[PDB]
mmCIF file of C-alpha atoms in Angstrom:
data_model
loop_
_atom_site.group_PDB
_atom_site.id
_atom_site.type_symbol
_atom_site.label_atom_id
_atom_site.label_comp_id
_atom_site.label_asym_id
_atom_site.label_seq_id
_atom_site.Cartn_x
_atom_site.Cartn_y
_atom_site.Cartn_z
ATOM 1 C CA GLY A 1 91.716 104.093 98.599
ATOM 2 C CA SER A 2 90.332 100.554 98.320
ATOM 3 C CA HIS A 3 89.986 98.770 101.727
ATOM 4 C CA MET A 4 93.630 99.761 102.732
ATOM 5 C CA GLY A 5 94.348 96.043 103.218
ATOM 6 C CA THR A 6 97.790 95.653 104.790
ATOM 7 C CA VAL A 7 99.895 98.753 105.610
ATOM 8 C CA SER A 8 102.709 100.169 107.788
ATOM 9 C CA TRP A 9 101.107 102.557 110.219
ATOM 10 C CA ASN A 10 102.247 103.015 113.829
ATOM 11 C CA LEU A 11 100.243 102.671 117.063
ATOM 12 C CA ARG A 12 99.383 106.403 117.104
ATOM 13 C CA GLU A 13 98.329 106.439 113.431
ATOM 14 C CA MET A 14 96.276 103.227 113.835
ATOM 15 C CA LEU A 15 94.564 104.577 116.984
ATOM 16 C CA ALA A 16 93.868 108.075 115.611
ATOM 17 C CA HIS A 17 92.652 106.710 112.255
ATOM 18 C CA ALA A 18 89.753 104.822 113.917
ATOM 19 C CA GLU A 19 89.077 107.787 116.262
ATOM 20 C CA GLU A 20 88.487 109.848 113.086
ATOM 21 C CA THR A 21 86.851 106.974 111.134
ATOM 22 C CA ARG A 22 84.304 104.230 111.803
ATOM 23 C CA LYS A 23 86.544 101.195 112.135
ATOM 24 C CA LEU A 24 86.480 98.896 115.169
ATOM 25 C CA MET A 25 89.773 98.742 117.087
ATOM 26 C CA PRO A 26 89.989 95.127 118.399
ATOM 27 C CA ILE A 27 92.954 94.882 120.842
ATOM 28 C CA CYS A 28 94.293 91.969 122.951
ATOM 29 C CA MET A 29 94.365 92.604 126.727
ATOM 30 C CA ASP A 30 97.805 90.824 126.677
ATOM 31 C CA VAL A 31 99.686 93.690 124.896
ATOM 32 C CA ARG A 32 101.174 96.468 127.124
ATOM 33 C CA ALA A 33 102.488 98.189 123.943
ATOM 34 C CA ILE A 34 98.817 99.035 123.227
ATOM 35 C CA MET A 35 96.859 98.484 126.523
ATOM 36 C CA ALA A 36 98.905 101.063 128.458
ATOM 37 C CA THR A 37 98.248 103.738 125.783
ATOM 38 C CA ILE A 38 94.476 103.257 126.179
ATOM 39 C CA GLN A 39 94.429 103.643 130.009
ATOM 40 C CA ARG A 40 96.899 106.544 129.555
ATOM 41 C CA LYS A 41 94.762 108.421 126.982
ATOM 42 C CA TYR A 42 91.177 107.336 127.856
ATOM 43 C CA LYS A 43 90.557 107.549 131.633
ATOM 44 C CA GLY A 44 86.737 106.879 131.687
ATOM 45 C CA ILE A 45 86.819 103.213 130.527
ATOM 46 C CA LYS A 46 86.647 99.762 132.245
ATOM 47 C CA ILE A 47 88.726 96.789 131.004
ATOM 48 C CA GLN A 48 86.759 93.571 130.429
ATOM 49 C CA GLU A 49 86.710 90.745 127.814
ATOM 50 C CA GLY A 50 83.662 92.447 126.217
ATOM 51 C CA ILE A 51 82.873 95.341 123.915
ATOM 52 C CA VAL A 52 83.501 98.814 125.271
ATOM 53 C CA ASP A 53 81.918 101.945 123.697
ATOM 54 C CA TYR A 54 84.413 104.602 124.843
ATOM 55 C CA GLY A 55 86.780 106.109 122.260
ATOM 56 C CA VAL A 56 86.997 103.458 119.529
ATOM 57 C CA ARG A 57 84.489 100.684 120.223
ATOM 58 C CA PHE A 58 87.311 98.764 121.861
ATOM 59 C CA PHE A 59 86.831 94.999 121.734
ATOM 60 C CA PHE A 60 89.272 93.514 124.257
ATOM 61 C CA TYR A 61 90.053 89.788 124.778
ATOM 62 C CA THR A 62 91.847 87.645 127.337
ATOM 63 C CA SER A 63 94.575 85.213 126.157
ATOM 64 C CA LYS A 64 92.292 82.566 127.764
ATOM 65 C CA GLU A 65 90.089 82.513 124.654
ATOM 66 C CA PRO A 66 91.577 80.918 121.455
ATOM 67 C CA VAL A 67 92.527 83.119 118.473
ATOM 68 C CA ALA A 68 89.909 81.273 116.372
ATOM 69 C CA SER A 69 87.146 82.345 118.791
ATOM 70 C CA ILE A 70 88.198 86.041 118.463
ATOM 71 C CA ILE A 71 87.952 85.686 114.629
ATOM 72 C CA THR A 72 84.492 84.140 115.156
ATOM 73 C CA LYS A 73 83.204 87.072 117.291
ATOM 74 C CA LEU A 74 84.731 89.631 114.846
ATOM 75 C CA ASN A 75 83.111 87.825 111.870
ATOM 76 C CA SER A 76 79.707 88.880 113.251
ATOM 77 C CA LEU A 77 80.382 92.631 113.726
ATOM 78 C CA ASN A 78 80.863 92.865 109.914
ATOM 79 C CA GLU A 79 82.511 96.310 110.125
ATOM 80 C CA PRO A 80 85.936 97.252 108.692
ATOM 81 C CA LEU A 81 88.563 97.110 111.469
ATOM 82 C CA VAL A 82 92.120 98.314 112.136
ATOM 83 C CA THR A 83 94.435 96.153 114.322
ATOM 84 C CA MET A 84 97.855 94.441 114.664
ATOM 85 C CA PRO A 85 97.960 90.624 114.098
ATOM 86 C CA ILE A 86 96.273 89.210 117.196
ATOM 87 C CA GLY A 87 98.161 85.881 117.326
ATOM 88 C CA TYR A 88 101.914 86.634 117.575
ATOM 89 C CA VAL A 89 102.740 86.738 121.327
ATOM 90 C CA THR A 90 99.466 85.886 123.139
ATOM 91 C CA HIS A 91 99.968 82.509 121.316
ATOM 92 C CA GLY A 92 103.746 82.593 120.460
ATOM 93 C CA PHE A 93 103.165 82.648 116.670
ATOM 94 C CA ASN A 94 105.522 83.917 113.924
ATOM 95 C CA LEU A 95 104.651 86.362 111.082
ATOM 96 C CA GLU A 96 103.249 83.586 108.788
ATOM 97 C CA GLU A 97 101.042 81.962 111.463
ATOM 98 C CA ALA A 98 100.067 85.490 112.537
ATOM 99 C CA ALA A 99 98.959 86.163 108.907
ATOM 100 C CA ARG A 100 97.162 82.833 108.231
ATOM 101 C CA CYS A 101 95.270 83.523 111.464
ATOM 102 C CA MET A 102 94.078 87.041 110.435
ATOM 103 C CA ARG A 103 93.176 85.910 106.850
ATOM 104 C CA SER A 104 90.362 83.777 108.413
ATOM 105 C CA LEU A 105 88.310 86.906 109.301
ATOM 106 C CA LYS A 106 86.110 87.811 106.320
ATOM 107 C CA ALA A 107 85.501 91.461 107.288
ATOM 108 C CA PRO A 108 88.478 93.718 106.312
ATOM 109 C CA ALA A 109 90.852 94.220 109.228
ATOM 110 C CA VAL A 110 93.354 96.776 108.068
ATOM 111 C CA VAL A 111 96.559 95.423 109.606
ATOM 112 C CA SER A 112 100.149 96.683 110.133
ATOM 113 C CA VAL A 113 103.729 95.337 110.535
ATOM 114 C CA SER A 114 106.879 96.880 112.100
ATOM 115 C CA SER A 115 108.223 98.094 108.649
ATOM 116 C CA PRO A 116 106.866 99.401 105.257
ATOM 117 C CA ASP A 117 109.007 96.697 103.619
ATOM 118 C CA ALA A 118 107.296 93.858 105.553
ATOM 119 C CA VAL A 119 103.804 95.042 104.420
ATOM 120 C CA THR A 120 104.079 92.900 101.297
ATOM 121 C CA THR A 121 105.865 90.085 103.226
ATOM 122 C CA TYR A 122 102.781 89.771 105.471
ATOM 123 C CA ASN A 123 100.374 89.786 102.463
ATOM 124 C CA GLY A 124 102.712 87.167 100.894
ATOM 125 C CA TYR A 125 101.567 84.625 103.514
ATOM 126 C CA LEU A 126 97.838 85.365 102.855
ATOM 127 C CA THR A 127 98.430 84.252 99.252
ATOM 128 C CA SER A 128 101.006 81.494 99.878
ATOM 129 C CA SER A 129 100.577 78.137 98.337
#
């Protein structure tokens, strides 16, 4: 209900949700927690910095490109999305920086944290003053 916003799913839930539904799954190449699970599950795919059209429209990126430029590309797809906060490790951010990054994307990326309790904490930073 509503746009889901900010939640506590897990990697399997987040993946399977956008298998079943029509959300993009943007993923950083720099995340073995996720990357490995794609090449494990989906065999018939090629990694690049581009769009892929195998499984869940996977839009991969190299750490080479700035976080702001990923937001910029994603702003043009204008689909609802499901991801983890892109900038946390591939830029060495913390949870607040990681939030104020994602907020920049107009299209609704459903996004998750490592606990149901932190779901509001994350949203907290979107609406900081």
